Amino acid sequence: SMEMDEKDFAADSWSLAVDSSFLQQHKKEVMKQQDVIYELIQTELHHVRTLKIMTRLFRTGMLEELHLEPGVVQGLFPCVDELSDIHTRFLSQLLERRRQALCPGSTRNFVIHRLGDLLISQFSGPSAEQMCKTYSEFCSRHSKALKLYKELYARDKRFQQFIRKVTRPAVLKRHGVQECILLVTQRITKYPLLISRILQHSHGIEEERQDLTTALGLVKELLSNVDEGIYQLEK
Amino acid sequence: AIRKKLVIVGDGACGKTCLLIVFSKDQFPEVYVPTVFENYVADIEVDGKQVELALWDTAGQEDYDRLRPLSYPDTDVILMCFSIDSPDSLENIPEKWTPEVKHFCPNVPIILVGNKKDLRNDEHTRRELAKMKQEPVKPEEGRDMANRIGAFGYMECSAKTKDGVREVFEMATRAALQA
Ligand SMILES: *CC(=O)Nc1cccc(C(=O)NC)c1
């Protein structure tokens, strides 16, 4: 992740991210709605950070430092490039929706009034089909990935040393190869919880309440198909 | 420092996300309680042993029976959560959660946790539960459930008042260390 985006979401909430004098001019319900929206983007930033760790630090590190069959790397980190491209476009669209909302002469004060359309475009049509088909793949290969890792760690002393070396920095304390895989698998089940809590504080504009309701039913439709498309592969 | 994995299972609004956020932040969030919990690796020293404890949540996976079991691999301790202000969430402990946690995690120590214990002395909770001919889960019913499901132990806590929270995660580490 980039420094600009890290500081923009370094705060524990939206009410702490903006200036205190800017927050004081808004109704409590607006603050409660923006707090949950901010959390959706903050956790989408952490999700893309996790995918970038798998692709650039683990997956890439293994190809250049260790010399193992590239198919073993494909089995260790399945559909990661595709998942990276899917969420980086989503984070890109979420971050520009925040920047458009910025108060003139400020880099921290903003009020996102339209979010629904963005969620509908993401969780519908070809994007939902590509995401459903990618998450179903990832989750079917999830167990085989954890096993293949445990095997490589219990047999290879150079792979054991590589994992000790890359995961030494404190920033990666909760971000090992296995934590990253479950982190990704659990991401899709977060969206309904986040979209339902945004929807709960979005009964101000009717077209917004209907867009957030359509996106809520659209995420659950995706999750139900992802759940129906899982067939666990053995090692 | 040994690495042991903790997973918290339980019904929808049983308070497992709140419990996890409160413990990982030491305090109850004053300005904003987050909707989701990603993961946390906690440094716990119990009885003179230093352990690194990964914390995981099954919140959001309750409806997706093919996705949910992907949380279970390599689990060393299970926290089976239920809410004290919802006697119907305890009914699903031996019917729904125990058979699943025993199928995917055989021999893994389970601690039955009674969350929201403060709500026992709540007027609004005692009122709404009485309207359905009910009352908050009594400690004897929690102990009797932990006994019937063959749990390692029974513990009560309150994510809101933080009472009992530190004692659960230390005990979870003691169970995870048992081989
Ligand atoms: C964009 C911008 O100037 N926002 C802002 C920040 C602090 C305070 C105010 C304001 O209107 N105070 C009366 C606006």
Side-chain angles (χ1 to χ4, degrees), chain A residues 13 15 35-36 39 46 150 173-174 178-179 182 186 189-190 197 227 232, chain B residues 3 31-33 35-39 43 52 57 64 66-67 71 74:
Chain A
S13 71
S15 56
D35 270 353
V36 190
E39 195 196 351
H46 295 167
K150 288 179 282 200
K173 203 186 171 75
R174 29 136 127 164
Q178 278 161 311
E179 285 71 34
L182 184 56
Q186 299 197 340
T189 52
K190 305 293 184 179
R197 199 180 166 188
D227 187 71
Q232 288 256 268
Chain B
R3 170 69 75 97
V31 153
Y32 181 69
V33 194
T35 317
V36 305
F37 175 87
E38 309 136 283
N39 84 341
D43 287 306
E52 275 218 338
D57 207 359
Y64 313 96
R66 252 147 295 187
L67 270 166
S71 296
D74 290 327

PDB file of all heavy atoms in Angstrom, chain A residues 13 15 35-36 39 46 150 173-174 178-179 182 186 189-190 197 227 232, chain B residues 3 31-33 35-39 43 52 57 64 66-67 71 74:
ATOM      1  N   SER A  13     -11.749   5.418  13.043  1.00  0.00           N
ATOM      2  CA  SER A  13     -13.103   5.633  12.526  1.00  0.00           C
ATOM      3  C   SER A  13     -13.133   6.831  11.580  1.00  0.00           C
ATOM      4  O   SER A  13     -12.100   7.459  11.357  1.00  0.00           O
ATOM      5  CB  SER A  13     -14.082   5.854  13.679  1.00  0.00           C
ATOM      6  OG  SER A  13     -13.885   7.116  14.297  1.00  0.00           O
ATOM      7  N   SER A  15     -15.131   9.542  12.184  1.00  0.00           N
ATOM      8  CA  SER A  15     -15.161  10.685  13.099  1.00  0.00           C
ATOM      9  C   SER A  15     -13.777  11.083  13.649  1.00  0.00           C
ATOM     10  O   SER A  15     -13.587  12.219  14.071  1.00  0.00           O
ATOM     11  CB  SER A  15     -16.154  10.461  14.233  1.00  0.00           C
ATOM     12  OG  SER A  15     -15.892   9.268  14.952  1.00  0.00           O
ATOM     13  N   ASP A  35     -19.059   6.291   9.294  1.00  0.00           N
ATOM     14  CA  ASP A  35     -18.156   5.459  10.082  1.00  0.00           C
ATOM     15  C   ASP A  35     -18.093   4.066   9.460  1.00  0.00           C
ATOM     16  O   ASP A  35     -16.986   3.544   9.258  1.00  0.00           O
ATOM     17  CB  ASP A  35     -18.616   5.389  11.554  1.00  0.00           C
ATOM     18  CG  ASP A  35     -18.064   6.465  12.488  1.00  0.00           C
ATOM     19  OD1 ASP A  35     -17.197   7.240  12.055  1.00  0.00           O
ATOM     20  OD2 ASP A  35     -18.501   6.524  13.658  1.00  0.00           O
ATOM     21  N   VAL A  36     -19.277   3.483   9.105  1.00  0.00           N
ATOM     22  CA  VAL A  36     -19.366   2.144   8.508  1.00  0.00           C
ATOM     23  C   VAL A  36     -18.824   2.132   7.070  1.00  0.00           C
ATOM     24  O   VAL A  36     -18.141   1.157   6.708  1.00  0.00           O
ATOM     25  CB  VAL A  36     -20.776   1.490   8.616  1.00  0.00           C
ATOM     26  CG1 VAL A  36     -20.742   0.024   8.203  1.00  0.00           C
ATOM     27  CG2 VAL A  36     -21.348   1.627  10.022  1.00  0.00           C
ATOM     28  N   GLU A  39     -15.127   2.158   7.172  1.00  0.00           N
ATOM     29  CA  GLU A  39     -14.656   0.833   7.541  1.00  0.00           C
ATOM     30  C   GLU A  39     -14.642  -0.107   6.346  1.00  0.00           C
ATOM     31  O   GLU A  39     -13.741  -0.932   6.244  1.00  0.00           O
ATOM     32  CB  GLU A  39     -15.503   0.241   8.663  1.00  0.00           C
ATOM     33  CG  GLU A  39     -14.832  -0.956   9.310  1.00  0.00           C
ATOM     34  CD  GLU A  39     -15.740  -1.827  10.154  1.00  0.00           C
ATOM     35  OE1 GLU A  39     -16.905  -1.430  10.397  1.00  0.00           O
ATOM     36  OE2 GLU A  39     -15.281  -2.908  10.589  1.00  0.00           O
ATOM     37  N   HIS A  46      -6.940  -3.006   3.437  1.00  0.00           N
ATOM     38  CA  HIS A  46      -6.208  -4.077   4.107  1.00  0.00           C
ATOM     39  C   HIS A  46      -6.287  -5.364   3.271  1.00  0.00           C
ATOM     40  O   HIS A  46      -5.311  -6.104   3.209  1.00  0.00           O
ATOM     41  CB  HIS A  46      -6.760  -4.325   5.509  1.00  0.00           C
ATOM     42  CG  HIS A  46      -6.595  -3.191   6.477  1.00  0.00           C
ATOM     43  ND1 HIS A  46      -7.282  -3.171   7.688  1.00  0.00           N
ATOM     44  CD2 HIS A  46      -5.841  -2.068   6.388  1.00  0.00           C
ATOM     45  CE1 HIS A  46      -6.930  -2.044   8.287  1.00  0.00           C
ATOM     46  NE2 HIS A  46      -6.068  -1.344   7.548  1.00  0.00           N
ATOM     47  N   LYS A 150       2.517 -26.863   4.346  1.00  0.00           N
ATOM     48  CA  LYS A 150       2.965 -27.641   5.496  1.00  0.00           C
ATOM     49  C   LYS A 150       3.959 -28.718   5.073  1.00  0.00           C
ATOM     50  O   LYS A 150       4.918 -28.975   5.794  1.00  0.00           O
ATOM     51  CB  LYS A 150       1.761 -28.228   6.266  1.00  0.00           C
ATOM     52  CG  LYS A 150       0.973 -27.169   7.042  1.00  0.00           C
ATOM     53  CD  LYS A 150      -0.226 -27.734   7.786  1.00  0.00           C
ATOM     54  CE  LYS A 150      -1.394 -27.982   6.864  1.00  0.00           C
ATOM     55  NZ  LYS A 150      -2.700 -28.074   7.585  1.00  0.00           N
ATOM     56  N   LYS A 173       3.062  -9.734  11.257  1.00  0.00           N
ATOM     57  CA  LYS A 173       2.821 -10.631  12.394  1.00  0.00           C
ATOM     58  C   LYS A 173       1.611 -11.528  12.161  1.00  0.00           C
ATOM     59  O   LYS A 173       1.707 -12.735  12.336  1.00  0.00           O
ATOM     60  CB  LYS A 173       2.678  -9.849  13.707  1.00  0.00           C
ATOM     61  CG  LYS A 173       2.978 -10.696  14.940  1.00  0.00           C
ATOM     62  CD  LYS A 173       2.686  -9.955  16.240  1.00  0.00           C
ATOM     63  CE  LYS A 173       2.764 -10.856  17.450  1.00  0.00           C
ATOM     64  NZ  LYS A 173       4.166 -11.181  17.824  1.00  0.00           N
ATOM     65  N   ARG A 174       0.502 -10.954  11.691  1.00  0.00           N
ATOM     66  CA  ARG A 174      -0.716 -11.715  11.381  1.00  0.00           C
ATOM     67  C   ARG A 174      -0.892 -11.982   9.887  1.00  0.00           C
ATOM     68  O   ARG A 174      -2.013 -12.139   9.421  1.00  0.00           O
ATOM     69  CB  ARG A 174      -1.959 -10.986  11.917  1.00  0.00           C
ATOM     70  CG  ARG A 174      -1.812  -9.488  11.968  1.00  0.00           C
ATOM     71  CD  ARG A 174      -3.041  -8.818  11.453  1.00  0.00           C
ATOM     72  NE  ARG A 174      -3.545  -7.853  12.422  1.00  0.00           N
ATOM     73  CZ  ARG A 174      -4.428  -6.902  12.137  1.00  0.00           C
ATOM     74  NH1 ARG A 174      -4.926  -6.792  10.905  1.00  0.00           N
ATOM     75  NH2 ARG A 174      -4.830  -6.059  13.083  1.00  0.00           N
ATOM     76  N   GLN A 178      -0.410 -18.990   5.484  1.00  0.00           N
ATOM     77  CA  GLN A 178      -1.691 -19.546   5.911  1.00  0.00           C
ATOM     78  C   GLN A 178      -2.694 -18.517   6.375  1.00  0.00           C
ATOM     79  O   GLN A 178      -3.879 -18.665   6.068  1.00  0.00           O
ATOM     80  CB  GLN A 178      -1.496 -20.613   6.974  1.00  0.00           C
ATOM     81  CG  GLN A 178      -1.148 -21.959   6.381  1.00  0.00           C
ATOM     82  CD  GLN A 178      -0.544 -22.811   7.437  1.00  0.00           C
ATOM     83  OE1 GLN A 178       0.371 -22.371   8.145  1.00  0.00           O
ATOM     84  NE2 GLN A 178      -1.051 -24.040   7.574  1.00  0.00           N
ATOM     85  N   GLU A 179      -2.251 -17.469   7.097  1.00  0.00           N
ATOM     86  CA  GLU A 179      -3.183 -16.424   7.547  1.00  0.00           C
ATOM     87  C   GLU A 179      -3.737 -15.697   6.341  1.00  0.00           C
ATOM     88  O   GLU A 179      -4.935 -15.446   6.294  1.00  0.00           O
ATOM     89  CB  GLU A 179      -2.521 -15.397   8.482  1.00  0.00           C
ATOM     90  CG  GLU A 179      -2.270 -15.872   9.894  1.00  0.00           C
ATOM     91  CD  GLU A 179      -1.166 -16.901   9.995  1.00  0.00           C
ATOM     92  OE1 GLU A 179      -0.194 -16.814   9.210  1.00  0.00           O
ATOM     93  OE2 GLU A 179      -1.277 -17.801  10.856  1.00  0.00           O
ATOM     94  N   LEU A 182      -6.636 -17.739   4.579  1.00  0.00           N
ATOM     95  CA  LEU A 182      -7.923 -17.657   5.283  1.00  0.00           C
ATOM     96  C   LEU A 182      -8.450 -16.219   5.290  1.00  0.00           C
ATOM     97  O   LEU A 182      -9.645 -16.009   5.094  1.00  0.00           O
ATOM     98  CB  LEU A 182      -7.906 -18.295   6.688  1.00  0.00           C
ATOM     99  CG  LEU A 182      -9.260 -18.337   7.444  1.00  0.00           C
ATOM    100  CD1 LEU A 182     -10.349 -19.042   6.623  1.00  0.00           C
ATOM    101  CD2 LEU A 182      -9.105 -18.963   8.841  1.00  0.00           C
ATOM    102  N   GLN A 186     -12.238 -15.456   3.914  1.00  0.00           N
ATOM    103  CA  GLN A 186     -13.237 -14.805   4.765  1.00  0.00           C
ATOM    104  C   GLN A 186     -13.702 -13.408   4.278  1.00  0.00           C
ATOM    105  O   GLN A 186     -14.718 -12.914   4.758  1.00  0.00           O
ATOM    106  CB  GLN A 186     -12.735 -14.725   6.218  1.00  0.00           C
ATOM    107  CG  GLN A 186     -12.469 -16.081   6.867  1.00  0.00           C
ATOM    108  CD  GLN A 186     -12.387 -16.001   8.378  1.00  0.00           C
ATOM    109  OE1 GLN A 186     -12.156 -14.940   8.969  1.00  0.00           O
ATOM    110  NE2 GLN A 186     -12.578 -17.129   9.040  1.00  0.00           N
ATOM    111  N   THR A 189     -17.426 -12.945   2.873  1.00  0.00           N
ATOM    112  CA  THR A 189     -18.485 -13.011   3.882  1.00  0.00           C
ATOM    113  C   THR A 189     -18.576 -11.746   4.759  1.00  0.00           C
ATOM    114  O   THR A 189     -19.494 -11.663   5.578  1.00  0.00           O
ATOM    115  CB  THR A 189     -18.364 -14.285   4.712  1.00  0.00           C
ATOM    116  OG1 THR A 189     -17.035 -14.381   5.225  1.00  0.00           O
ATOM    117  CG2 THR A 189     -18.691 -15.531   3.904  1.00  0.00           C
ATOM    118  N   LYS A 190     -17.666 -10.756   4.574  1.00  0.00           N
ATOM    119  CA  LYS A 190     -17.679  -9.510   5.333  1.00  0.00           C
ATOM    120  C   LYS A 190     -18.632  -8.529   4.720  1.00  0.00           C
ATOM    121  O   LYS A 190     -19.276  -7.796   5.463  1.00  0.00           O
ATOM    122  CB  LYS A 190     -16.294  -8.850   5.386  1.00  0.00           C
ATOM    123  CG  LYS A 190     -15.189  -9.738   5.909  1.00  0.00           C
ATOM    124  CD  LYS A 190     -15.383 -10.072   7.363  1.00  0.00           C
ATOM    125  CE  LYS A 190     -14.246 -10.869   7.927  1.00  0.00           C
ATOM    126  NZ  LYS A 190     -14.468 -11.164   9.366  1.00  0.00           N
ATOM    127  N   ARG A 197     -25.043  -2.779   7.626  1.00  0.00           N
ATOM    128  CA  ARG A 197     -24.867  -1.734   8.624  1.00  0.00           C
ATOM    129  C   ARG A 197     -24.854  -0.338   7.961  1.00  0.00           C
ATOM    130  O   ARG A 197     -25.318   0.627   8.574  1.00  0.00           O
ATOM    131  CB  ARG A 197     -23.639  -1.992   9.508  1.00  0.00           C
ATOM    132  CG  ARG A 197     -23.668  -1.209  10.819  1.00  0.00           C
ATOM    133  CD  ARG A 197     -22.444  -1.475  11.670  1.00  0.00           C
ATOM    134  NE  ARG A 197     -22.286  -0.503  12.755  1.00  0.00           N
ATOM    135  CZ  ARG A 197     -21.218  -0.424  13.543  1.00  0.00           C
ATOM    136  NH1 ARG A 197     -20.195  -1.247  13.370  1.00  0.00           N
ATOM    137  NH2 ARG A 197     -21.162   0.486  14.504  1.00  0.00           N
ATOM    138  N   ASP A 227     -20.676 -20.420  -2.516  1.00  0.00           N
ATOM    139  CA  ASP A 227     -20.885 -21.526  -1.583  1.00  0.00           C
ATOM    140  C   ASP A 227     -21.371 -22.786  -2.320  1.00  0.00           C
ATOM    141  O   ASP A 227     -20.997 -23.897  -1.954  1.00  0.00           O
ATOM    142  CB  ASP A 227     -21.907 -21.122  -0.514  1.00  0.00           C
ATOM    143  CG  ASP A 227     -22.036 -22.159   0.558  1.00  0.00           C
ATOM    144  OD1 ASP A 227     -21.092 -22.297   1.350  1.00  0.00           O
ATOM    145  OD2 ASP A 227     -23.067 -22.871   0.578  1.00  0.00           O
ATOM    146  N   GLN A 232     -13.967 -29.159  -2.619  1.00  0.00           N
ATOM    147  CA  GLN A 232     -12.614 -29.261  -2.075  1.00  0.00           C
ATOM    148  C   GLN A 232     -11.687 -30.282  -2.746  1.00  0.00           C
ATOM    149  O   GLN A 232     -11.942 -31.489  -2.717  1.00  0.00           O
ATOM    150  CB  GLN A 232     -12.677 -29.538  -0.575  1.00  0.00           C
ATOM    151  CG  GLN A 232     -13.135 -28.344   0.231  1.00  0.00           C
ATOM    152  CD  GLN A 232     -11.959 -27.723   0.926  1.00  0.00           C
ATOM    153  OE1 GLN A 232     -11.650 -28.063   2.078  1.00  0.00           O
ATOM    154  NE2 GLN A 232     -11.269 -26.803   0.239  1.00  0.00           N
TER     155      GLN A 232
ATOM    156  N   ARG B   3       3.049 -21.267  18.429  1.00  0.00           N
ATOM    157  CA  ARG B   3       1.914 -20.688  17.727  1.00  0.00           C
ATOM    158  C   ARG B   3       0.749 -21.622  17.828  1.00  0.00           C
ATOM    159  O   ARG B   3       0.830 -22.765  17.381  1.00  0.00           O
ATOM    160  CB  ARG B   3       2.249 -20.400  16.254  1.00  0.00           C
ATOM    161  CG  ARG B   3       1.044 -20.009  15.391  1.00  0.00           C
ATOM    162  CD  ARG B   3       0.495 -18.658  15.768  1.00  0.00           C
ATOM    163  NE  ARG B   3       1.353 -17.574  15.291  1.00  0.00           N
ATOM    164  CZ  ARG B   3       1.150 -16.898  14.165  1.00  0.00           C
ATOM    165  NH1 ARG B   3       0.118 -17.192  13.381  1.00  0.00           N
ATOM    166  NH2 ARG B   3       1.975 -15.918  13.813  1.00  0.00           N
ATOM    167  N   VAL B  31     -15.321   5.259  20.756  1.00  0.00           N
ATOM    168  CA  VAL B  31     -15.949   6.008  19.664  1.00  0.00           C
ATOM    169  C   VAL B  31     -16.610   5.103  18.580  1.00  0.00           C
ATOM    170  O   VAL B  31     -17.708   5.438  18.125  1.00  0.00           O
ATOM    171  CB  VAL B  31     -14.938   7.026  19.068  1.00  0.00           C
ATOM    172  CG1 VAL B  31     -15.211   7.359  17.598  1.00  0.00           C
ATOM    173  CG2 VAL B  31     -14.900   8.292  19.913  1.00  0.00           C
ATOM    174  N   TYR B  32     -15.955   4.008  18.146  1.00  0.00           N
ATOM    175  CA  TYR B  32     -16.537   3.169  17.101  1.00  0.00           C
ATOM    176  C   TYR B  32     -16.268   1.685  17.281  1.00  0.00           C
ATOM    177  O   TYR B  32     -15.116   1.262  17.346  1.00  0.00           O
ATOM    178  CB  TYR B  32     -16.081   3.650  15.723  1.00  0.00           C
ATOM    179  CG  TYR B  32     -16.636   2.855  14.562  1.00  0.00           C
ATOM    180  CD1 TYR B  32     -17.983   2.912  14.236  1.00  0.00           C
ATOM    181  CD2 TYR B  32     -15.808   2.077  13.766  1.00  0.00           C
ATOM    182  CE1 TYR B  32     -18.504   2.156  13.194  1.00  0.00           C
ATOM    183  CE2 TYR B  32     -16.318   1.316  12.722  1.00  0.00           C
ATOM    184  CZ  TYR B  32     -17.664   1.365  12.436  1.00  0.00           C
ATOM    185  OH  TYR B  32     -18.158   0.633  11.392  1.00  0.00           O
ATOM    186  N   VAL B  33     -17.335   0.887  17.347  1.00  0.00           N
ATOM    187  CA  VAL B  33     -17.205  -0.563  17.454  1.00  0.00           C
ATOM    188  C   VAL B  33     -17.220  -1.093  16.023  1.00  0.00           C
ATOM    189  O   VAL B  33     -18.219  -0.928  15.322  1.00  0.00           O
ATOM    190  CB  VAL B  33     -18.344  -1.216  18.279  1.00  0.00           C
ATOM    191  CG1 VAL B  33     -17.983  -2.656  18.653  1.00  0.00           C
ATOM    192  CG2 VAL B  33     -18.686  -0.399  19.521  1.00  0.00           C
ATOM    193  N   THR B  35     -17.715  -3.331  12.730  1.00  0.00           N
ATOM    194  CA  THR B  35     -18.649  -4.359  12.252  1.00  0.00           C
ATOM    195  C   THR B  35     -17.926  -5.702  12.046  1.00  0.00           C
ATOM    196  O   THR B  35     -18.487  -6.769  12.317  1.00  0.00           O
ATOM    197  CB  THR B  35     -19.228  -3.940  10.879  1.00  0.00           C
ATOM    198  OG1 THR B  35     -19.566  -2.555  10.871  1.00  0.00           O
ATOM    199  CG2 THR B  35     -20.406  -4.798  10.452  1.00  0.00           C
ATOM    200  N   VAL B  36     -16.695  -5.645  11.537  1.00  0.00           N
ATOM    201  CA  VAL B  36     -15.941  -6.840  11.229  1.00  0.00           C
ATOM    202  C   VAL B  36     -14.631  -6.946  12.029  1.00  0.00           C
ATOM    203  O   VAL B  36     -14.135  -5.966  12.578  1.00  0.00           O
ATOM    204  CB  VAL B  36     -15.697  -6.971   9.691  1.00  0.00           C
ATOM    205  CG1 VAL B  36     -17.007  -6.921   8.905  1.00  0.00           C
ATOM    206  CG2 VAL B  36     -14.706  -5.922   9.198  1.00  0.00           C
ATOM    207  N   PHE B  37     -14.087  -8.153  12.088  1.00  0.00           N
ATOM    208  CA  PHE B  37     -12.818  -8.451  12.704  1.00  0.00           C
ATOM    209  C   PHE B  37     -12.050  -9.257  11.631  1.00  0.00           C
ATOM    210  O   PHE B  37     -12.550 -10.301  11.203  1.00  0.00           O
ATOM    211  CB  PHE B  37     -13.060  -9.295  13.961  1.00  0.00           C
ATOM    212  CG  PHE B  37     -11.816  -9.783  14.651  1.00  0.00           C
ATOM    213  CD1 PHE B  37     -11.178  -9.000  15.598  1.00  0.00           C
ATOM    214  CD2 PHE B  37     -11.303 -11.035  14.381  1.00  0.00           C
ATOM    215  CE1 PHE B  37     -10.034  -9.453  16.238  1.00  0.00           C
ATOM    216  CE2 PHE B  37     -10.170 -11.492  15.042  1.00  0.00           C
ATOM    217  CZ  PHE B  37      -9.540 -10.697  15.955  1.00  0.00           C
ATOM    218  N   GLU B  38     -10.885  -8.767  11.159  1.00  0.00           N
ATOM    219  CA  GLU B  38     -10.112  -9.495  10.141  1.00  0.00           C
ATOM    220  C   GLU B  38      -9.401 -10.731  10.752  1.00  0.00           C
ATOM    221  O   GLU B  38      -9.752 -11.863  10.428  1.00  0.00           O
ATOM    222  CB  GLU B  38      -9.138  -8.556   9.410  1.00  0.00           C
ATOM    223  CG  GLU B  38      -9.821  -7.312   8.887  1.00  0.00           C
ATOM    224  CD  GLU B  38      -9.073  -6.012   9.114  1.00  0.00           C
ATOM    225  OE1 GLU B  38      -9.090  -5.503  10.261  1.00  0.00           O
ATOM    226  OE2 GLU B  38      -8.485  -5.494   8.135  1.00  0.00           O
ATOM    227  N   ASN B  39      -8.444 -10.491  11.661  1.00  0.00           N
ATOM    228  CA  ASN B  39      -7.669 -11.459  12.443  1.00  0.00           C
ATOM    229  C   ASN B  39      -6.722 -10.710  13.392  1.00  0.00           C
ATOM    230  O   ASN B  39      -6.509  -9.509  13.240  1.00  0.00           O
ATOM    231  CB  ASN B  39      -6.942 -12.540  11.585  1.00  0.00           C
ATOM    232  CG  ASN B  39      -5.603 -12.139  11.007  1.00  0.00           C
ATOM    233  OD1 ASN B  39      -5.276 -10.959  10.895  1.00  0.00           O
ATOM    234  ND2 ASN B  39      -4.801 -13.114  10.603  1.00  0.00           N
ATOM    235  N   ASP B  43      -0.077 -11.856  21.862  1.00  0.00           N
ATOM    236  CA  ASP B  43       1.028 -12.357  22.678  1.00  0.00           C
ATOM    237  C   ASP B  43       0.531 -12.537  24.093  1.00  0.00           C
ATOM    238  O   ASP B  43       0.296 -11.567  24.821  1.00  0.00           O
ATOM    239  CB  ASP B  43       2.207 -11.398  22.648  1.00  0.00           C
ATOM    240  CG  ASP B  43       2.931 -11.433  21.333  1.00  0.00           C
ATOM    241  OD1 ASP B  43       3.334 -12.543  20.908  1.00  0.00           O
ATOM    242  OD2 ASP B  43       3.103 -10.352  20.725  1.00  0.00           O
ATOM    243  N   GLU B  52       1.905 -17.319  21.001  1.00  0.00           N
ATOM    244  CA  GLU B  52       1.413 -16.437  19.943  1.00  0.00           C
ATOM    245  C   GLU B  52       0.054 -17.046  19.575  1.00  0.00           C
ATOM    246  O   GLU B  52       0.020 -18.185  19.109  1.00  0.00           O
ATOM    247  CB  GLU B  52       2.341 -16.493  18.710  1.00  0.00           C
ATOM    248  CG  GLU B  52       3.548 -15.571  18.771  1.00  0.00           C
ATOM    249  CD  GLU B  52       3.907 -14.940  17.435  1.00  0.00           C
ATOM    250  OE1 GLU B  52       3.522 -15.503  16.384  1.00  0.00           O
ATOM    251  OE2 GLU B  52       4.565 -13.874  17.439  1.00  0.00           O
ATOM    252  N   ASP B  57     -12.604 -15.598  13.396  1.00  0.00           N
ATOM    253  CA  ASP B  57     -14.031 -15.440  13.581  1.00  0.00           C
ATOM    254  C   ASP B  57     -14.779 -16.177  12.499  1.00  0.00           C
ATOM    255  O   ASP B  57     -14.346 -16.176  11.344  1.00  0.00           O
ATOM    256  CB  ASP B  57     -14.366 -13.929  13.481  1.00  0.00           C
ATOM    257  CG  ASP B  57     -15.596 -13.477  14.240  1.00  0.00           C
ATOM    258  OD1 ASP B  57     -16.248 -14.333  14.870  1.00  0.00           O
ATOM    259  OD2 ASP B  57     -15.909 -12.258  14.195  1.00  0.00           O
ATOM    260  N   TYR B  64     -23.276 -20.139   5.154  1.00  0.00           N
ATOM    261  CA  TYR B  64     -22.547 -20.782   4.065  1.00  0.00           C
ATOM    262  C   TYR B  64     -21.773 -21.987   4.548  1.00  0.00           C
ATOM    263  O   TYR B  64     -20.590 -21.894   4.857  1.00  0.00           O
ATOM    264  CB  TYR B  64     -21.670 -19.742   3.324  1.00  0.00           C
ATOM    265  CG  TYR B  64     -22.434 -18.476   2.999  1.00  0.00           C
ATOM    266  CD1 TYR B  64     -22.358 -17.365   3.827  1.00  0.00           C
ATOM    267  CD2 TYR B  64     -23.362 -18.450   1.967  1.00  0.00           C
ATOM    268  CE1 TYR B  64     -23.151 -16.247   3.610  1.00  0.00           C
ATOM    269  CE2 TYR B  64     -24.159 -17.335   1.739  1.00  0.00           C
ATOM    270  CZ  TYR B  64     -24.041 -16.228   2.553  1.00  0.00           C
ATOM    271  OH  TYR B  64     -24.800 -15.104   2.306  1.00  0.00           O
ATOM    272  N   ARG B  66     -20.509 -24.584   3.104  1.00  0.00           N
ATOM    273  CA  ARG B  66     -19.337 -25.088   2.381  1.00  0.00           C
ATOM    274  C   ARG B  66     -18.110 -24.187   2.625  1.00  0.00           C
ATOM    275  O   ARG B  66     -16.983 -24.677   2.663  1.00  0.00           O
ATOM    276  CB  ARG B  66     -19.616 -25.259   0.889  1.00  0.00           C
ATOM    277  CG  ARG B  66     -19.734 -26.716   0.470  1.00  0.00           C
ATOM    278  CD  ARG B  66     -20.727 -26.890  -0.659  1.00  0.00           C
ATOM    279  NE  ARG B  66     -22.085 -26.553  -0.225  1.00  0.00           N
ATOM    280  CZ  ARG B  66     -23.180 -26.729  -0.961  1.00  0.00           C
ATOM    281  NH1 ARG B  66     -23.090 -27.236  -2.188  1.00  0.00           N
ATOM    282  NH2 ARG B  66     -24.373 -26.404  -0.475  1.00  0.00           N
ATOM    283  N   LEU B  67     -18.334 -22.873   2.827  1.00  0.00           N
ATOM    284  CA  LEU B  67     -17.279 -21.883   3.103  1.00  0.00           C
ATOM    285  C   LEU B  67     -16.768 -21.962   4.534  1.00  0.00           C
ATOM    286  O   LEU B  67     -15.562 -21.907   4.746  1.00  0.00           O
ATOM    287  CB  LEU B  67     -17.819 -20.464   2.886  1.00  0.00           C
ATOM    288  CG  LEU B  67     -17.668 -19.921   1.527  1.00  0.00           C
ATOM    289  CD1 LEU B  67     -18.523 -18.705   1.365  1.00  0.00           C
ATOM    290  CD2 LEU B  67     -16.217 -19.638   1.240  1.00  0.00           C
ATOM    291  N   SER B  71     -12.432 -22.229   7.947  1.00  0.00           N
ATOM    292  CA  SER B  71     -11.896 -21.566   9.130  1.00  0.00           C
ATOM    293  C   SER B  71     -11.243 -22.555  10.075  1.00  0.00           C
ATOM    294  O   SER B  71     -10.275 -22.208  10.745  1.00  0.00           O
ATOM    295  CB  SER B  71     -13.007 -20.864   9.892  1.00  0.00           C
ATOM    296  OG  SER B  71     -13.575 -19.829   9.113  1.00  0.00           O
ATOM    297  N   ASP B  74      -6.327 -26.773  11.282  1.00  0.00           N
ATOM    298  CA  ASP B  74      -5.237 -26.547  12.228  1.00  0.00           C
ATOM    299  C   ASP B  74      -5.635 -25.817  13.508  1.00  0.00           C
ATOM    300  O   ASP B  74      -4.747 -25.331  14.217  1.00  0.00           O
ATOM    301  CB  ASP B  74      -4.037 -25.841  11.567  1.00  0.00           C
ATOM    302  CG  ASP B  74      -3.287 -26.716  10.579  1.00  0.00           C
ATOM    303  OD1 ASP B  74      -3.232 -27.956  10.803  1.00  0.00           O
ATOM    304  OD2 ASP B  74      -2.754 -26.165   9.573  1.00  0.00           O
TER     305      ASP B  74
END
